[PDB]
Amino acid sequence: STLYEKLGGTTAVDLAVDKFYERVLQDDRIKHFFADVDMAKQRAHQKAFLTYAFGGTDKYDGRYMREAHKELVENHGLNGEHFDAVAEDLLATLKEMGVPEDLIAEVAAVAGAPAHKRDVLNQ
């Protein structure tokens, strides 16, 4: 079974992403990164992306992480502390949802992988 399946499939990822962005938009460390972002589109992209990242689909139909975040890094100071806040807010959300700690560990490994971090941060 994939991580996506184990989490609860579409409805779990849908709820997690909704809740995650509710948390992010109240998080003073990072909320301003989203000030000019269409959140309906963002929510849809993230549901699709995490579905992919959790093994629910073979491909992500949207931008690569590096291009997606380039303008934040170059113009808005996006750094490692912001990255950790995002990972932390994602894990807090799953925890709140009652996700078992072994699956939170699996998500931690995806969100913290260098192939993710280096591209997001354009490092």
33 lines the binding site for ligand HEM (CB under 6 A)? yes
Q: Give whichever of 71 and 101 is closer to ligand HEM, judged by the CB atom.
A: 71
Residue type, 110: V
19 within 8 A of 97, measured Cβ to Cβ: yes
69 has binding-site annotation = yes
21 lines the binding site for ligand HEM (CB under 6 A)? no
For tokens 């997001």, the residue is 120
18 within 8 A of 57, measured Cβ to Cβ: no
Indicate which single residue of 12, 86, 94, 107 sits in contact with ligand HEM (rule: CB under 6 A). Answer: 86
Q: Name the nearest CA neighbour of 91 among 77, 108, 106, 73.
A: 108
Interface contacts to ligand HEM, rule CB under 6 A = 30, 33-34, 37, 42, 45-46, 49, 62-63, 68-69, 72, 78, 82-83, 86-87, 111, 116, 120
User: Which residues sit in the known binding site?
Assistant: 45, 69, 116
